[PDB]
Amino acid sequence: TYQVVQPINGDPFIGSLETPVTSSPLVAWYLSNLPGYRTAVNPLLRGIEVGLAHGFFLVGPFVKAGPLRNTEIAGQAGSLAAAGLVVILSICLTIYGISSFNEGDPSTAPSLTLTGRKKQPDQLQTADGWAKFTGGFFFGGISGVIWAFFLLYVLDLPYY
Amino acid sequence: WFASKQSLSYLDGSLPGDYGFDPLGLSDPEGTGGFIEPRWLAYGEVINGRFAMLGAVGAIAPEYLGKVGLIPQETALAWFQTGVIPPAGTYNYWADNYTLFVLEMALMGFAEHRRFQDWAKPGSMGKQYFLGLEKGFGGSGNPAYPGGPFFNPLGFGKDEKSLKELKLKEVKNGRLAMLAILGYFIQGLVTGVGPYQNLLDHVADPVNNNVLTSL
Amino acid sequence: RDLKTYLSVAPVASTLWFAALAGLLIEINRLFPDALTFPFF
Amino acid sequence: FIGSSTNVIMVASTTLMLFAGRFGLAPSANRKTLADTLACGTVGHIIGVGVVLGLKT
Amino acid sequence: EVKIILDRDPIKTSFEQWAKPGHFSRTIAKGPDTTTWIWNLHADAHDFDSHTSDLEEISRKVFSAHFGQLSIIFLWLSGMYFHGARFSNYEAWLNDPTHIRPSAQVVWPIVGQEILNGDVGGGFRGIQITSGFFQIWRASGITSELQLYCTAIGALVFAGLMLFAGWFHYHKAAPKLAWFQDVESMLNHHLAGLLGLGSLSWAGHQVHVSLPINQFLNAGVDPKEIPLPHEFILNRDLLAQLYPSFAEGATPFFTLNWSKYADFLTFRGGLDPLTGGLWLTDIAHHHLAIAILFLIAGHMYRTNWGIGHGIKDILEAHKGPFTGQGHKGLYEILTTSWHAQLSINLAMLGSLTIVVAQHMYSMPPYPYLATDYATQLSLFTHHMWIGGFLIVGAAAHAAIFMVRDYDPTTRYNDLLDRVLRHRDAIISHLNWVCIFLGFHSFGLYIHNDTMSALGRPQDMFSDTAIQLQPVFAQWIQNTHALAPGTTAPGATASTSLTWGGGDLVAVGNKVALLPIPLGTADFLVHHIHAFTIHVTVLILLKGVLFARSSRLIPDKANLGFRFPCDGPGRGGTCQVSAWDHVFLGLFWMYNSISVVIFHFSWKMQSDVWGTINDQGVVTHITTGNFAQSSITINGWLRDFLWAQASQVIQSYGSSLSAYGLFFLGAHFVWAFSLMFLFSGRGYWQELIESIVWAHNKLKVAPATQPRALSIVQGRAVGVTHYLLGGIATTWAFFLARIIAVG
């Protein structure tokens, strides 16, 4: 009599369904606390965090699998590539925003809360906010790469 | 109101030797066609029984007699041994073994075929086609008992409702011969030797004898 | 059986026809093999 | 192997003994039970063999 | 309820309906007006549930049809045994199996074909067979052509009985619907009766005919001298001198205390160093366990004595929080729909054929089968295709069930439900996995090709550079090596020689089997397998789940199971049908199986098969180039295809020139398929309009108005020739290669 699997928000005529991986308290808590979902925070602020995390992470694959190392002294220079990819990406984001949102326009996110609490206007998703988000994404992206690289110079890690 | 073992609806007790036993429900008449019809089986047990009733005797009579009777080279070999080629290797005969069978199938072909006609038609056999005995044919209303006269020259309880008290006798003995012969098939098969001869070993001493013993 | 004759003359008519043709062709070849020309004129 | 035979008999007995404690024709089979004996017999044989082989090691 | 035999009396028998084409369908029994009529007649010939709606009649049709099928198989077996008696060198092969090529078909000397009767050895001219029948017959202890001839008659007699039964059970005594539905009964019998007694029966012929005769053959005694099988049954002395356990009768079995029977039954395992086949002493023992197991298994289901299981009971009691009341109602569905049953059975029988192939190559069952590479490559490849096809057929009937038999209002399931209620989640994910697998299997190859071509071998995915060692399969491989004595003390040698490690078996100068290495090359191909399989699954599962409805077509179920489309609207809706998903899935099964059998052929020649001399020196056929050149697409094109195709393109004038002919012949019909696959009936019908004009001109226009093939048929024709062409090419390529080189 107890099923775990339920229609979304109690509405069976809408797309999604409710499952442990979608509406668990752990999943809900985790996703609500990512920088992306902090609706009430500065978009620029939210971005930098995403950049930092992402940047930092990208150095690994480039350096270890790069043509330049692989026993070739080039080493940590790869990280530099990663610094190049965050530039490409930034470009894409800037483009996505420019094209999507217009200057005058307002947000396109959804104002109703899941519970119907109409009380909430939200987000970046505006020409102004998105620019901020990408702009912060970049700064964070470059800084992420640099600090990972910085660690590379100091060394000590088992993989490289 | 009669002794009975196992469960089924149509075993009325209207058939001779009915102990109401059909755990497999072979005689259930729900779906009938082919050789699964109930009446056919009734006829069959009797035929199989009559033949078996007769055969069991053949199986041992030659065996027994050469033992305390006047039979020489024709000394009964195992019942199994004359007919099947490998063990006894058979015995020569006035006629070739394969040929007899042809003749044998030929003779049977006539009697057996007609009997079937009795089953497919009441008096068809007894009707037409020249020769005496045709009158002999068609006899009875029931194929199982053609009511020979001919088949029954002597009324022999045919008239008395006591004929029932014969039917069962015929039926019970029949199952008995049947059972018996099946025994031989095994006895002779593991025992070798003759069913009767086989009997003696159990007889000479019994503790020593039997299947467990046999092994 | 009229009807059996009727089953026949269906596409079984094709196979009976082609089997006859194949046979004829085969025998001809068995009789006159490797012919690249008509040499009787 | 008399010990073996006794073991097999014990298993068979335990299985037939279940003609009460365990499954047989049970609630309402249209039979006057033969079926139960066989299965109990067969189950007993199987158990006996399993124990015996183990005894053999 | 009580289970019993239920039948009905005669239901007609006449040639009247033979004279009336398309009688089974009310639409098509009126005769032809166009040439479409003819094609429809053959395409709806076996669609029984399309003929009538009565379940009893459909069930009776498929029952006699199975008799018809068996009749053919028995007639087919009758010929193989007959040809092994009149037109074969089996008695010659029986003395020198390691050098004489097995052959069982002689060709008539017409038109020049006699060249195909090549030197197969034994002073015999004919076509080398790869069926494997010689190794079966030798394993059964078959000595003379007389015995093969007797089996030929026996099979033919059985063929007559099967055919007679079909007539008898459709025209004379037709089983009732209640009879077919007794599934608890049928499973009990097929478990115990067919499989249990069947395996028990063969365990007997082995321990009385096979095991005794095979020992003589291995001792080296002349086959003609070996006593007939019946001399072993009669005089137990012969079967006592060898396998002395027969001294006693039923003891020890009857007195238990098992066993002194370890003499002719054992858990030895591995491979016979003299025959190259699995120990017959193990196989006989194997069938002993299988018999009893299936005999035990044949008493699970309740029938007429209250003891057992109601399958309906079992299913309903299997419901969880995640699944609802699921499993409830499955019994009524599976006892009411033939297509539902056929889908499961095809999926499983097809899957079985695939594991058979992988088991018969790595554990060679018949004597002198392993070193006959011509047969082993054929047997493995044959079963891969048979299994491959049957699996695609499961998808077709799963789809047909969804369209035809699925009814929520009458036979709801809840398990089938929910699945339909998130079919987009399943297909979208299966979509993703395929893309991930494509990149991470095939993309690695393209990486390797580009790096090699740029002269960067160290930047490749290889054993000598960036290694992708399949450690999980390797660890298992090692585990089966250390299995005997440690894990399974009863096992003397390993399960397979591919797990042996330091053990090799040779017969003649050829290698039977050895430990098969696994490296980066094996890693890449397996993910290619994982990739191709999923995509096939995607196409077929998408077809089944979206067979009834779709956001594009809300009422697709009304259009049927086999329809061309729903017009050019909504952007175009060609091949939305479930049939067209089976059609698309067919190509991908072909794609997957083809790279599987290429994986086999190269790996065996390169790392397994080859010549071995009495110094230990092993020389493989392609010389171990799999590891360094199968990791590149150019390598497959060059070192595999280009190199090995030389035999079939250099076979003219030889005994193998028929393969040369079928090689080109199959390339032809393959390309031929592309005409149908790349075009549409709109063009062809208009072309036929101009041609019909010409016939009318000369008063030779037919009443049966010629029409272009239907949209669906055009696809049916196309995929059929694509398959025939592609598969037959590899066939000719494989056989020529392995017969010439092997």
Ligand code: CLA
């Ligand atoms: C257990 C096996 C099995 C059975 C009993 C069925 C039964 C059925 N199928 Mg299924 N099917 C199967 C396996 C099976 N199929 C497999 C393995 C596949 C994957 C390919 C399919 C894919 C499939 C599709 C797509 C369809 C069916 C359909 C049908 C139904 C009607 C088919 C018909 O009329 O026959 C007609 C038979 C022919 C027209 C013969 C055509 C010849 C083939 C195409 C080529 C043969 C070439 C040969 C192998 C070698 C070349 C020789 C040549 C040179 C002479 C019928 C219920 C149809 C349906 O609608 O279901 C209700 C349907 O559309 N099946």
Ligand code: CLA
């Ligand atoms: C060789 C020709 C070919 C190729 C490459 C493909 C490829 C694919 N098929 Mg198709 N298919 C083909 C023939 C082909 N098919 C034919 C003839 C048929 C008729 C039966 C089909 C029928 C078919 C169906 C029904 C389906 C597919 C699906 C797929 C996709 C599977 C998922 C995947 O692997 O993602 C990975 C992509 C690849 C492995 C392609 C190669 C990628 C390269 C190596 C790397 C990228 C290069 C470079 C970095 C890009 C930048 C270059 C820049 C200059 C632009 C994949 C894109 C399935 C699908 O849609 O996916 C879920 C699907 O359901 N196919």
